[PDB]
């Protein structure tokens, strides 16, 4: 059928087998009891047998066991089956669960009560969830809870719409950062529904909606690709009318107290039982629908585990139950008209055994696959039906190439059709493990049955709100270092003019206007105060003695461009036909903003010129995956590659990632780490020479002397910063003759990416925020239960955890202190003072699941990417700068597994409220906003710095980082334009005009400075008239006070384009721009009253009065276009 149900063709065939027919026949009368004993590898069509007959809810053991099944049902039943997301936090945990998890659940519950009302989607047929939602004492008023539907033609009032948003647990913010937020512009509304991949911008005209259009949180700009006209945004919590406020104060203290008030606080979810009506899920299911149960011996145990965690968390909350029993919840199934069906793979003669059996499973060794391809190569001979299922179309086509290579007929199938009678009609599908049904002579083998073991990047165009906290420190170009105090307004003459005040050392104040924000930036160099430059004539010396200092970095960085352009090299052939068969192992839809990272890195390879490209990203994987795509093209042209890493752990992480991905393609991928014994070295090195090792991945061992590649074609270096000094040069002597591919994690500002775009082509990738699942942050006193009670949670799903402790004198002692809390777990110490041999050993055990908890220091937590350690705990978070935390919890929640983060402070020693501003900031609007974003802007130190040369600590403290990397930029631009075979000064304008960003247009302060900056830095009207295209997209049509602000901006450009410094005034006078008698008299008829001086020009001009005798003045608008005309007339335009 429709391509969205690809696997339905294969399943409808298997279901035709009689073993399901009777199973469908027996489960056709809705028997109040049932018992089936079939292999667990076939949970999908067991439901797909009961599903279309009886619309049912299925229960999986874990959440992952629900998702893997929920896709196996969506692939056949399209969107008729919806996943019911299990929760994340325990009912009495102080962490509100994920907003997406809440809404995605609310969406499901309203589909139940209104399946025929397809206001959002088709009627639900099947539901999937773990037990943890089945035991949820849900307040039943959800399917009867109305969301806030909107439509373009609506008449909904402004202040009423927000009044329901704020009632639906929506957090007002400056700018929309995450799901569950919203902001109000002037008559324009920005909200973020939790069930959408993108937020929206519903535009109002009084009480009539003018427009609805999504927008990308990255740059907060809209997108025109998809136009929508209606929205549905369920609440973010499972509870807050005026009814419960009384039920809060009448009964942690501030929580219910603020709950009684209009102050919603985190952790409200722990007050659901107090605020009856324990309507279980069977009391929310539609009338007369059964419940399928998988692995009872698991869910039973799983039920107990969820139960004990409850009391384990309640008694943890008593530091200043949970789910109902399974049998009682079961007692309502046959009490509310709901059968109870059992599934199990354990042998049984009492129940109904199904004739379906398991399927083979090869792990890596192709020899076993020959014993599987032959099984395919024989069952089809007896007219048998068979088709290999795979997740990726590119891989599915490889199977056709791989089966025919093994002397076996094959062929890709149309999505939604059964396998052909005789051929292997390979079909893309999300099935996990193969299954064989003799009831139709049918055999299906998923690609996982060979791998045994089983998400893209994005480009950059972002914003920068000038968050300036009082007492901060900034660099002013023409003046020098400063100390920031406050943002002053001044209504002098009816017209506003906002300013910024800076404090100096001594002629002590300085109001920087809004036409000079491009000349300000933070200070990062000294990491400590320096001489606050006084307004005088010594700071300029510090500048002039710095421009000369950049020559070494000027000549060197521009030299590599000369050498690379001189030395030609192998231009790689275009994309091998095999390329678009590895790149499509995932059924996901590619993003035309992730392609541009490869086509950038590809075309650079495709030139005869070598490649000098750099990737600076935080994702860790999405850029790592880019390597395998490039390294695949290279060896396809017959040119072995080399991959460099600074940690032997990284050599193994990548090698497994490479091997798993490059499994099924003939490319040798041997590796060279420290723990690869020398008996394996001599096989690698020699294998490198004879052209057998197609791909080598190794530590600094690959740099030492006695190595040689047979015409190495591609070098990939990962996180150059960790590499040693003398190793950092042996790669500098390597970028000249081979297409190196540098990749780092230091975040680079958007200056370098364009400041040096001809020299070193750098690129910055970042996982788009609307696609990252945030980490549930907690901030509380240092309790020895809440830690341990949290530890066992992550430990339940066989995950690990980071327990950081900086002060190296206690970490050894504070290590065992953990074990007394959790002795059942495994803990290890790790820090920088550990020698080389011990550290990469202790860490390598960690990645191989020989341990459960890592007592690391702030360093080792960073630079360690673990696909399972989704739990962070931080003792004494009061001693940590705001930035490090953002790096710290970045390591948790990278994969699909949602991650937590526990920040702790001493028990009864009250922390400074300044530090309270720290730990509150990390709790509220974390990923971006006012506070934390100001930190990662200061992250330009390593970003702008360590990406090029290093921090010359003596030549920065006094100029600051931002001014350093900005200085070599034009210094390189001087060297760029130099070989071909001083810019004008600043202009000051003071006109009686209303040119300001009014607060009623831009409510916030920082969001107002960016527009002031983003417009005062534009270099051409094309750029000036461009920010307007952004402002109306974000805040609405420019009011007349702003149109003048745009007007004077162009007037500056025309003035600068004509050599003008001061245009001052009823006597409009301009700069010393001199005039010849040719035009010096041309002004007569043009403007009579004026006059001019040949030496000190200062062209004086009178103001025009319209009308007759009443003597007004020409309107503000009519003025600027006049001044923008006489300038054009003088020079001639």
Asked if 991 contacts 1044 with a C-beta cutoff of 8 angstroms, the reply is no
Asked if 944 contacts 907 with a C-beta cutoff of 8 angstroms, the reply is no
Q: What is the DSSP letter of 424?
A: B
Q: Among 926, 948, 965, which residue terminates a domain?
A: 926
The annotation status of 624 as a binding-site residue, yes or no, is yes
Show the 3-state SS of 989-1029.
ECCCCCCCCCCCCCCCCHHHHHHHHHHHCCCCHHHHHHHHH
Structure-token pair, residue 298: 């698991």
| Domain count along the chain | 6
Show the 3-state SS of 509-577.
EEEECCCCHHHEEECCCCCCCCCCCCCCCCHHHHHHHHHHHHHHHHHHHHHHHHHHHHCCCCCCCCCCC
Using CA atoms, how far apart are residues 884 and 864, in angstroms rounded to an integer? 14
Which residues neighbour 84 within 8 Å (Cβ) at sequence distance 6 or greater? 57, 66, 105, 108, 127, 128, 129, 133
Asked if 994 contacts 1044 with a C-beta cutoff of 8 angstroms, the reply is yes
Using CA atoms, how far apart are residues 293 and 57, in angstroms rounded to an integer? 9
For the chain, the farthest-separated pair of C-alpha atoms sits apart, in whole angstroms, at: 113
Residues 705, 625: one domain? yes
The annotation status of 617 as a binding-site residue, yes or no, is yes
The annotation status of 619 as a binding-site residue, yes or no, is yes
Method of determination used here? X-ray
Residues 199, 58: one domain? no
Q: How far is CA 321 from the centre of its chain?
A: 37
Q: What is the bridge-based pairing of β-strands 425-428 and 480-488?
A: unpaired
Which residues neighbour 902 within 8 Å (Cβ) at sequence distance 6 or greater? 778, 780, 786, 787, 790, 871, 872, 873, 874
CATH number for the domain including 1024? 3.90.1150.50
Buried (b) or exposed (e) across 16-53, using 16+ Cβ within 10 A? ebebbeebbeebeebeeebbbbbbbbbbbbbbbbbbbe
> Hey, is 391 helix, strand or coil?
coil
Q: Among 899, 926, 953, which residue terminates a domain?
A: 926
Using CA atoms, how far apart are residues 595 and 863, in angstroms rounded to an integer? 26
Q: CA geometry: angle at 396 spanning 393 and 401, to 5°?
A: 130
* DSSP of 470-515: TT-EEEETTTEEEEEEEEE---SSS----EEEEE-----EEEE-TT
Buried (b) or exposed (e) across 162-197, using 16+ Cβ within 10 A? beebeebbbbebbbbbbbbbbbbbebbbbbbbbbbe
Using CA atoms, how far apart are residues 949 and 584, in angstroms rounded to an integer? 38
Using CA atoms, how far apart are residues 228 and 396, in angstroms rounded to an integer? 35
Q: How far is CA 371 from the centre of its chain?
A: 43
Residues 814, 869: one domain? yes
Task: Assess if residue 288 is contained within a domain.
Answer: yes
Residues 814, 881: one domain? yes
The annotation status of 561 as a binding-site residue, yes or no, is no
Residues 161, 187: one domain? yes
Task: Assess if residue 510 is contained within a domain.
Answer: no
Using CA atoms, how far apart are residues 126 and 103, in angstroms rounded to an integer? 18
Within 10 A of 511 (CB to CB), how many other CB atoms are there? 12
Task: Assess if residue 456 is contained within a domain.
Answer: no
Q: What is the DSSP letter of 438?
A: G
Domain that holds residue 158: 148-233
Q: Among 206, 233, 260, which residue terminates a domain?
A: 233
Task: Assess if residue 36 is contained within a domain.
Answer: yes
CATH number for the domain including 905? 3.40.50.300
Task: Assess if residue 481 is contained within a domain.
Answer: no
Q: What is the DSSP letter of 98?
A: -
Buried (b) or exposed (e) across 415-443, using 16+ Cβ within 10 A? bbbbbeeebbbbbbbbbbbbbbbebbbbb
Q: What is the bridge-based pairing of β-strands 425-428 and 385-390?
A: parallel
Backbone angles phi, psi at 422, to 5 degrees: 140, -35
CATH number for the domain including 286? 3.40.50.11180
Residues 738, 594: one domain? yes
Asked if 50 contacts 27 with a C-beta cutoff of 8 angstroms, the reply is yes
The annotation status of 623 as a binding-site residue, yes or no, is yes
Residues 345, 379: one domain? no
Task: Assess if residue 692 is contained within a domain.
Answer: yes
Task: Assess if residue 378 is contained within a domain.
Answer: yes
Residues 319, 219: one domain? no
Residues 44, 94: one domain? yes
Q: What is the bridge-based pairing of β-strands 900-905 and 871-874?
A: parallel
Q: What is the CA radius of gyration of the chain?
A: 34
Using CA atoms, how far apart are residues 1099 and 1068, in angstroms rounded to an integer? 8
The annotation status of 956 as a binding-site residue, yes or no, is no
Task: Assess if residue 885 is contained within a domain.
Answer: yes
Using CA atoms, how far apart are residues 713 and 642, in angstroms rounded to an integer? 8
Within 10 A of 1132 (CB to CB), how many other CB atoms are there? 7
Residues 347, 372: one domain? no
Distance linking the first and last C-alpha atoms of the chain: 65
1021-1034 and 1006-1016 helices, crossing angle to 10°: 160
Residues 735, 664: one domain? yes
Asked if 583 contacts 457 with a C-beta cutoff of 8 angstroms, the reply is no
Q: Which of 298, 40, 7, 62 is nearest to 896 (CA)?
A: 62
Residues 783, 900: one domain? yes
Using CA atoms, how far apart are residues 890 and 459, in angstroms rounded to an integer? 20
Using CA atoms, how far apart are residues 1090 and 1087, in angstroms rounded to an integer? 6
DSSP E strand stretches across 822-888: 827-829, 853-855, 871-874
Using CA atoms, how far apart are residues 750 and 213, in angstroms rounded to an integer? 27
């Amino acid at each position: 059928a429709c391509s969205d149900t690809p696997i339905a063709g294969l399943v409808e065939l298997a279901l035709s087998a009689p073993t399901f027919q009777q199973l469908m026949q027996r489960a056709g009368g809705r028997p109040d009891e049932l018992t089936l004993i079939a292999p667990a590898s076939a949970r999908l069509l067991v439901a797909s047998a009961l599903a279309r007959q009886g619309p049912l809810l299925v229960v999986t053991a874990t959440g992952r066991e629900a998702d893997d099944l929920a896709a196996e049902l969506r692939g056949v039943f399209g969107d008729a089956v919806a996943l019911l997301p299990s929760w994340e936090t325990l009912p009495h945990e102080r962490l509100s669960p994920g907003v997406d998890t809440v809404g995605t659940r609310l969406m499901a519950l309203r589909r139940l009560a209104h399946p025929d009302d397809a206001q959002l989607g088709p009627p639900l047929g099947v539901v999937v969830t773990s037990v943890r939602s089945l035991l949820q004492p849900m307040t039943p008023q959800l399917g009867m809870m109305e969301p806030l539907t909107l439509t373009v033609g609506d008449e909904s009032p402004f202040d009423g719409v927000v009044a329901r948003l704020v009632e639906l647990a929506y957090t007002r913010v400056d700018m929309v950062g995450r799901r569950g937020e919203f902001a109000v512009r002037g008559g324009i509304l920005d909200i973020f529904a939790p069930t959408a991949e993108h937020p929206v911008r519903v535009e109002f005209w009084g009480d009539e909606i003018t427009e609805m259009r999504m927008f990308s949180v990255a740059d907060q700009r809209s997108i025109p690709e998809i136009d929508i006209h209606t929205l549905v945004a369920f609440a973010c919590r499972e509870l807050l009318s005026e009814d419960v406020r009384a039920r809060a104060a009448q009964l942690a203290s501030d929580m219910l107290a603020k709950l009684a008030e209009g102050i919603a606080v985190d952790g409200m979810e722990a007050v659901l039982p107090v605020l009856d009506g324990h309507a279980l899920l069977t009391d929310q299911l539609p009338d007369g629908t059964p419940v399928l149960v998988c692995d009872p011996e698991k869910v039973r145990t799983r039920a107990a585990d969820l139960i004990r965690t409850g009391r384990e968390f309640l008694e943890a909350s008593w530091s200043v139950s949970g789910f109902v029993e399974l049998d009682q919840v079961r007692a309502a199934a046959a009490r509310t008209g709901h059968p109870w069906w059992t599934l199990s793979q354990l042998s049984d003669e009492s129940a109904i055994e199904l004739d379906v059996r398991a399927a083979p499973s090869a792990r890596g060794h192709q020899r076993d696959i020959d014993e599987i391809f032959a099984m395919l190569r024989a069952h089809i001979a007896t007219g048998g039906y068979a088709a290999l299922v795979a997740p990726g179309t590119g891989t599915a086509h490889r199977v056709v190439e791989r089966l025919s290579e093994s002397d076996t007929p094959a062929g890709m199938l149309d999505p939604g059709q059964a396998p052909k009678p005789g051929v292997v009609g390979v079909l893309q599908g999300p099935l996990r493990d193969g299954v064989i049904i003799p009831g139709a002579n049918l055999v299906v083998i998923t690609e996982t049955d060979l791998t045994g073991s089983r998400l893209a990047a994005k480009r950059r165009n972002i914003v920068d709100p000038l968050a300036l906290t009082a007492g901060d420190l900034v660099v002013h170009d023409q003046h020098g270092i400063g100390r920031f105090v406050e943002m002053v307004e001044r209504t002098v003459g009816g017209a506003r003019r906002e300013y910024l005040v800076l404090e100096y050392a001594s002629t002590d104040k300085l109001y920087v206007p809004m036409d000079s924000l491009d000349q300000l930036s933070r200070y990062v160099g000294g990491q400590a105060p320096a001489l606050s430059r006084l307004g005088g004539s010594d700071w300029a010396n510090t500048k002039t003695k710095a421009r000369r200092a950049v020559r070494e970095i000027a000549g060197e960085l521009v030299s590599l461009y000369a050498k690379r352009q001189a030395s030609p090299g192998h231009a790689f052939s275009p994309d091998t036909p095999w390329q678009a068969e590895l790149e499509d192992a995932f059924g996901f839809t590619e993003t035309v903003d992730q392609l541009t990272a490869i086509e950038e890195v590809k075309a650079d390879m495709e030139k005869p010129i070598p490649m000098d490209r750099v990737i600076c990203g935080d994702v860790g994987y999405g850029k790592t995956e880019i390597a395998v795509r490039a390294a695949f093209k290279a060896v396809q042209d017959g040119k072995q590659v080399a991959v460099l890493v600074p940690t032997t752990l990284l050599a193994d992480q990548h090698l497994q990632t490479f091997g798993e991905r490059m499994s099924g393609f003939p490319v040798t991928i041997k590796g060279l780490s420290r723990f690869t014994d020398a008996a394996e070295s001599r096989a690698v090195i020699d294998g490198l020479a004879d052209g057998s090792v197609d791909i080598v991945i190794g530590t600094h061992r690959l740099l030492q002397t006695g190595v040689r590649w047979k015409d190495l074609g591609l070098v990939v270096v990962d996180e150059e910063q960790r590499f040693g000094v003398e190793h950092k040069e042996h790669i500098k002597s390597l970028r000249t003759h081979v297409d190196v591919l540098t990749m780092s994690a230091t975040p680079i500002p958007r200056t370098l990416e364009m400041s040096l775009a001809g020299i070193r082509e750098m690129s910055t990738i970042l996982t788009p925020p609307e696609e990252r699942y945030p980490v549930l942050t907690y901030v509380g006193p240092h309790d020895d239960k809440q830690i341990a009670a949290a530890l066992r949670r992550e430990l339940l799903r066989d995950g690990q955890a980071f327990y950081v402790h900086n002060r190296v004198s206690s970490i050894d002692a504070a290590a065992a202190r953990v074990r007394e809390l959790v002795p059942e777990a495994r803990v290890v110490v790790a820090h920088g003072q550990m020698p080389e041999d011990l550290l990469e050993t202790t860490v390598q055990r960690f990645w191989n699941r020989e341990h459960d908890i890592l007592v690391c220091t702030t360093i080792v937590e960073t630079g360690l990417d673990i696909s399972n350690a989704n739990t962070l705990i931080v003792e004494r978070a009061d001693t940590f700068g705001l930035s490090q935390l953002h790096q710290l919890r970045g390591r948790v929640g990278r994969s699909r597994e949602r991650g937590y983060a526990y920040f702790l402070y001493p028990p009864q020693v009250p922390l400074t409220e300044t530090a309270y501003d720290r730990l509150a900031t990390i709790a509220q609007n974390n990923e971006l906003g006012a506070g934390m974003a100001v930190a990662l802007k200061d992250l330009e130190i390593r970003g702008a710095g360590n990406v090029l040369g290093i921090e010359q600590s003596g030549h920065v403290a006094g100029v600051g980082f931002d001014l350093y990397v900005r200085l070599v930029g034009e210094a390189l631009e001087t060297y760029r334009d130099a070989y071909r075979a001083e810019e004008p000064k600043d202009v000051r304008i003071d006109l009686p005009v209303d040119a300001h960003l009014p607060p009623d247009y831009i409510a916030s302060d920082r969001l107002r400075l960016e527009g002031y900056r983003r417009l005062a830095a534009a270099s051409s009207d094309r750029e000036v008239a461009a920010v307007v295209d952004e402002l109306t997209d974000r805040y609405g049509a420019l009011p007349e006070p702003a149109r003048r602000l745009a007007a004077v901006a162009r007037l500056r450009l025309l003035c600068r384009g004509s050599g003008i410094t001061d245009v001052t005034a009823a006597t409009v006078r301009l700069s010393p721009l001199t005039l010849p008698d040719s035009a010096q008299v041309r002004l007569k008829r043009m403007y009579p009253g004026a006059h001019y001086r040949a030496t000190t020009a200062t062209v004086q001009v009178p103001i025009p009065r319209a009308g007759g005798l009443g003597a007004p003045r020409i309107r503000d608008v009519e003025l600027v276009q006049m001044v923008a005309d006489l300038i054009t007339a003088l020079a001639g335009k």
